[PDB]
Each structure stands twice: as structure tokens, then as C-alpha cells.
């Protein structure tokens, strides 16, 4: 790969520069190169990996949503035949999005998840695995959709099981996993009651644990708790 000749430490340094410059594609490429050096990622490095790909796919998802909305309007009664272009361009963005998801999932499967034994790292990577399968599920229409949904649920569930055993309720990774799995239930899996139940129990159990939360993690965990409350307000 194009990053094979660069030192691991230089790749991490440049991922940090790319983040500051909001160059998320470059950030992701640097972090993929770092992962491919074959050493486990530290806690800070895991965050660089996740932020890079979250931002790349986030932009692709936003664009896909705009184009899918145009396409759906184009297929309603009274809409004028505008030819294949909207579908073609939506398919182009979709295929690029799928490619990025596949790249992330490949990194996770080789070999980040296999070698992650500490709960932080294992839950973190399984959450990512659930997230990228969820993004594939958002665009899946074919025979593939149910299997993709099942793959997302299986990753999120393994992460949930570990997080409940090994992390406190206010751990930010545990909270963010529960936030995203609740969104999976609501938006992907047609299980709004499960989504609401998960968000409420997560929020309530985190409140009761706030008295043990570190000042260093207060900001991250309270932000995620606010996002859980925002979703519950949207949903009820």
C-alpha cells in the first residue's frame, strides 16, 4: 500500500495534522497505513482511526441522503421522466460509500478485533463493526439487507455483552455503543420499543454512576448522555 514506506510514528503524526486541517480522507489513509504496520493501536490512536472514517462516511451518507431524496421524489406520481442520471449518480456515491465501509470492516477483521483483549479496545472495535454494517444497511435494498442488519446486530450485541461485564455505566465507549445500538434498533431494525428501552436504561444507569465519573471523562460522557436524552425526546 501507498503508506508502506512511511514510519508508523510519521503516519500517526500526519493523521493528527490531517485532523487539524479537516482532511478526513487523508486522515483515514494515514490511519489505515498505521493499522497495516501490524501493531495494536493505543487508546489515542483508536480515536484517530474512528474519527477519520466516521467523517469520511458521514459526508458520503449526507450526500447519499440528498440524492436518494431527489430519486424518490422523481419516482412519485406526476414527476417528470428525467432519465437515468439521478439513479446513476446515487449509485456512484453508494458504491463509494460501500467501498469505504468494506475497507473499515476489513481492517477490523484483519487484525484489530482478533488481537484486542482489553475491554476498551474490544468494545471500541466491535462498536465500529456495528456502525459500518449499519451504514451498509442504510443503503441496502437487495437480498443482502437482512444479512447486513444481522451482522450489525451481532457486532453490537457482542460489544454490549462485554461492556456490561467490564466497563462502568458512565464509560464513554459503553455509552456511545448503547446510543448507537439504540439508533440501530429504531432506524434499521424496526424495533422502536427496544430502542427506547435501551436508551432509557442506559441513561438512568449512567446518572446513578455519575458520582464515580472522572473529570477527564465528564465532558464526553455527559455529551453522550445528552444525546441519549435528545433521542428519547425525539422518540416519545
Amino acid at each position: 500500500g501507498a503508506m508502506g514506506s512511511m514510519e508508523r510514528a510519521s503516519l500517526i503524526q500526519k493523521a493528527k495534522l490531517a485532523e487539524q486541517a479537516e482532511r478526513y480522507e487523508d486522515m483515514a489513509a494515514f490511519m489505515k497505513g498505521a493499522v497495516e504496520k501490524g501493531e495494536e493501536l493505543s487508546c489515542e490512536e483508536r480515536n484517530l482511526l474512528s474519527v477519520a472514517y466516521k467523517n469520511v462516511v458521514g459526508g458520503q451518507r449526507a450526500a447519499w441522503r440528498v440524492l436518494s431524496s431527489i430519486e424518490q421524489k422523481s419516482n412519485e406520481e406526476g414527476s417528470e421522466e428525467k432519465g437515468p442520471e439521478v439513479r446513476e449518480y446515487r449509485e456512484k456515491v453508494e458504491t463509494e460509500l460501500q467501498g469505504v465501509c468494506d475497507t473499515v470492516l476489513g481492517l477490523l477483521d484483519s487484525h484489530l478485533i482478533k488481537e484486542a483483549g482489553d475491554a476498551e479496545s474490544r468494545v471500541f472495535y466491535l462498536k465500529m463493526k456495528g456502525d459500518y454494517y449499519r451504514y451498509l444497511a442504510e443503503v441496502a435494498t437487495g437480498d443482502d439487507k437482512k444479512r447486513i442488519i444481522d451482522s450489525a446486530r451481532s457486532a453490537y450485541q457482542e460489544a454490549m455483552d462485554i461492556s456490561k461485564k467490564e466497563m462502568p455505566p458512565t464509560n464513554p465507549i459503553r455509552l456511545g455503543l448503547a446510543l448507537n445500538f439504540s439508533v440501530f434498533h429504531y432506524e434499521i431494525a424496526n424495533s422502536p420499543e427496544e430502542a427506547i428501552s435501551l436508551a432509557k436504561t442506559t441513561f438512568d444507569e449512567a446518572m446513578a454512576d455519575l458520582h464515580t465519573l472522572s473529570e477527564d471523562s465528564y465532558k464526553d460522557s455527559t455529551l453522550i448522555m445528552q444525546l441519549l436524552r435528545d433521542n428519547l425526546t425525539l422518540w416519545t
Partner: peptide, 5 residues
């Protein structure tokens, strides 16, 4: 859309 992190 709902919030994720």
C-alpha cells in the same frame, strides 16, 4: 435523524 457518536 437521531444522534449517534
Amino acid at each position: 435523524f437521531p444522534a449517534t457518536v
